[PDB]
Design a binder for this molecule. Structure first.
Ligand SMILES: [Mg+2]
Ligand SMILES: [Mg+2]
Ligand SMILES: [Mg+2]
Ligand SMILES: [Mg+2]
Lengths: 112, 102, 116, 145, 56
RNA sequence: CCGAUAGUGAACCAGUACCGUGAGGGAAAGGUGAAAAGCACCCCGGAAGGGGAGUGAAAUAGAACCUGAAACCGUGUGCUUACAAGUAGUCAGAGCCCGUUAAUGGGUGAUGGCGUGCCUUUUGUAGAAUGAACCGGCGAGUUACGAUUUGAUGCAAGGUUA
RNA sequence: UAACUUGGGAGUCAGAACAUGGGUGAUAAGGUCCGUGUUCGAAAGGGAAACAGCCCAGACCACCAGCUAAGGUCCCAAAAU
RNA sequence: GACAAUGGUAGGAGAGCGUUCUAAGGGCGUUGAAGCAUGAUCGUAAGGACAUGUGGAGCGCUUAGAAGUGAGAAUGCCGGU
């Protein structure tokens, strides 16, 4: 059928996450769990949680099975932007952007 | 067998059953206009001729007498303060053919 | 009574930008650039209508001469043959004739060649 | 806009011709030839496409030059490195790679467009009196000189 | 020193046809029934590179 | 007369935070819904966050809560693109696809012709002279008194009030 | 078919090239200073390869009609090898 | 119906569109206002209706009057990207 799950205000930029997604989009679940769960980065824990969480809600609420579950689409969008500033020479400043994110996964089975 | 006619200041090729557009004639719908100037009719019995081949008459129906697509005019000189803009539609008259030369 | 100048500006700017559909990069989203590119467009039209008339006169002449090289009647001998014959038509009909039917054109050239 | 015949890739015809190069001069030839390949001299001419014909040219070597410009007509390219100019050859190129000579002498009477460079590929020159392309049932052709 | 021009939305993307990252090596376990990476250890259950030789 | 970049600088915990040794200078920041009825309960999760279930007419109104544009960023997809010299469009136009505020239709566009941005200042600028990173907002001939002429209007050798 | 007066309102006072009679300068200058006239400036379009001023000519709008001007007719690039 | 004119900066004259508010008249609005978005529509232009979606309470129209009445550019202020 359809299924999804979300994470919001996650304290990572979009891009660094977006690469990791481009290792995902199209696969089957089990594989993608593995793919995330091995690569040594900071996003892999998070996406792993959100993915398996999505399978959780799909299982409990919608009563699916796990074989045919595939990643229909996934994408991360921009979030609030905690402006900071690091000092710098000659009496000046420079405003860092501590970025955020809103991760979106939509697990699907494809059938009814 | 087709023939060549005159209208406005220009000409058209017509085969019988064909449609045409042309600048306005100011003759309402269904009032079948009949041309009087013709310049050529070929095919089988070929008759090229003097201007206004005589004995030659076309008939046709006035389907629609509408208006055109509003093209924009616009233009300007550069680095100066000048410009202009004024649309212009066009009237036309839409005919199809019965009875190539009488 | 102060006047919030809003509520029109955006609308005007949409009436511009929506004449920028098919333009490249940031020319189809931004007001400024699409304004000035539009103005180039309208001007270009105002020379292009003229230009198409010039063009198709060239084209028709080209095709016609490509016909009358068959009888080795270079294009000018012909036309002078036509003004002398006491007949005259446009171009584009010599084109469509000499494209869709050959024989008719041949009979024209006979009618003109014999006036020289 | 109104009626007039235009020409497509499917409303088309293309042919393969022979031309003797011997006993003939270079100007007259290249002009008339690229007056073929350009699509001119056909009443289906439409210049947003290629009604370009094909042409075969045989026995280039016997072409001839009037006056000097046997030798005092120099050809120049540049190798894009500095001081890499080359007068390296002259009209003696007729002796060696004469086919190249013609094939550049025509491809300057054509534009640099994408079309114009497609036409020029529809030419095949042979300084020798043989050709492989007889499969096409090619024709002869008579120039006006 | 500096750019003179604005780097448009195309070239910023074409330039990024190579920040992708490679599909890492993978294979199922020989008797731990799951995936891991090649010429490496499982991290589970008892370690299985040829079978258990470790605890962690 | 203004209706949150206006109007007190200040609609809110402002002469505050802040800056400066000090005189002193000086901010940004309104809105859930009718009523708090402000998400019991299950599930993943360490949490946060979320999917469900429910309150409510509506929760894509769920607290960073009316409306939610543009820049900007993405996900997918109809068309198209790897011998090609491009102020980027326009004109002509095949091919492929689609069907409208139903009319000389709309989306894309192989290929050809044609074509050196905008304002300012200038004898003249593609200009290698200047300004603009984009977009949203703001923002510049006003008012009194008086003279003068123009047009109108009422009276008329009279007219007019402070 | 314009000319004059009165009244209201301004703008302009840095001009350039081409030809032409001249001064200066070296019978030098895309020079400078004057008279004379044109065009540009405030005017596009066709030709001069390309171009503010040279040459033909003064755009109300639209047409897939025609005849001509300067300049051109082998290909590029329409038109007489 | 004829005849003729209709390039144009500085600049002079004239007719005009829309916004906010007011006065008067006449009208619309949960059986969904305004705004917003989309659209292949009308007008010579500035511009205006219409259909649909979102939106959740005020708005248009005719006549005339007064204006803080229009913004692409200030090495412009602010905000966001
Ligand atoms: Mg507000
Ligand atoms: Mg201006
Ligand atoms: Mg100067
Ligand atoms: Mg701005």
């Amino acid at each position: 059928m359809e299924a999804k799950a979300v994470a919001r205000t996650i304290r990572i930029a979009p891009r660094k996450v977006r690469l990791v997604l481009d290792l995902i989009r199209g696969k089957n679940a089990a594989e993608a769990i593995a793919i995330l769960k091995l690569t040594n980065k900071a996003s892999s824990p998070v996406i792993e949680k959100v993915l398996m969480s999505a399978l959780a809600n799909a299982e409990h609420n919608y009563d699916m099975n796990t074989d045919e579950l595939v990643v229909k689409e996934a994408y991360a969008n921009e979030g609030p932007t905690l402006k900071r500033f690091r000092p710098r020479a000659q009496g000046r400043a420079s405003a860092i952007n501590k970025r955020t994110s809103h991760i979106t996964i939509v697990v699907s089975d494809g059938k009814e | 067998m087709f023939a060549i006619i005159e209208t406005g200041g220009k000409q058209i090729k017509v085969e019988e059953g064909q449609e045409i557009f042309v600048e306005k004639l100011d003759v309402n719908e269904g009032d079948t206009f009949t041309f009087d100037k013709v310049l050529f009719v070929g095919g089988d019995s070929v008759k090229v001729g003097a201007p206004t081949v005589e004995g030659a008459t076309v008939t046709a129906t006035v389907n629609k007498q509408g208006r055109g697509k509003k093209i924009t005019v616009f233009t300007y000189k550069r680095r100066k303060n000048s410009k202009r803009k004024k649309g212009h539609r066009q009237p036309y008259t839409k005919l199809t053919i019965d009875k190539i030369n009488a | 009574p102060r006047v919030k100048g809003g509520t029109v500006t955006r609308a005007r700017r949409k009436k511009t930008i929506k004449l920028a559909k098919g333009y490249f990069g940031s020319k189809h989203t931004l007001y400024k650039v699409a304004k000035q590119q539009v103005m180039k467009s309208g001007q270009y039209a105002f020379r292009d209508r003229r230009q198409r008339k010039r063009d198709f006169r060239k084209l028709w002449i080209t095709r016609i001469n490509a016909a009358a090289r068959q009888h080795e009647m270079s294009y000018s001998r012909l036309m002078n043959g036509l003004k002398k014959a006491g007949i005259d038509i446009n171009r584009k009909m010599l084109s469509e004739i000499a494209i869709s039917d050959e024989k008719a054109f041949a009979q024209l050239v006979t009618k003109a060649k014999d006036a020289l | 806009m109104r009626q007039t015949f235009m020409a497509n890739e499917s409303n088309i015809e293309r042919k393969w011709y022979v031309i003797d190069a011997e006993g003939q001069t270079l100007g007259r030839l290249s002009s008339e030839v690229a007056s073929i390949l350009r699509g001119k001299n056909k009443v289906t001419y439409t210049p947003h496409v290629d009604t370009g014909d094909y042409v075969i040219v045989i026995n280039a070597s016997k072409i001839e030059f009037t006056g000097n410009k046997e030798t005092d007509k120099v050809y120049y390219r540049h190798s894009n490195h500095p001081g890499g100019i080359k007068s390296i050859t002259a009209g003696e190129l007729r002796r060696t790679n004469p086919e190249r000579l013609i094939e550049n002498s025509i491809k300057g009477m054509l534009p640099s467009t994408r079309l114009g460079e497609k036409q020029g590929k529809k030419l095949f020159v042979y300084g020798g009196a043989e050709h492989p392309h007889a499969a096409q049932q090619p024709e002869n052709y008579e120039l006006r000189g | 020193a500096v750019p003179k021009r604005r780097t448009s939305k195309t070239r910023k993307n074409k330039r990024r046809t190579h920040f992708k990252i490679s599909v890492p090596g993978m294979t199922e376990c020989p008797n731990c029934g799951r995936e891991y990476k090649l010429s490496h250890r499982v991290c589970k259950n008892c370690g299985s590179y040829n079978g258990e030789e470790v605890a962690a």
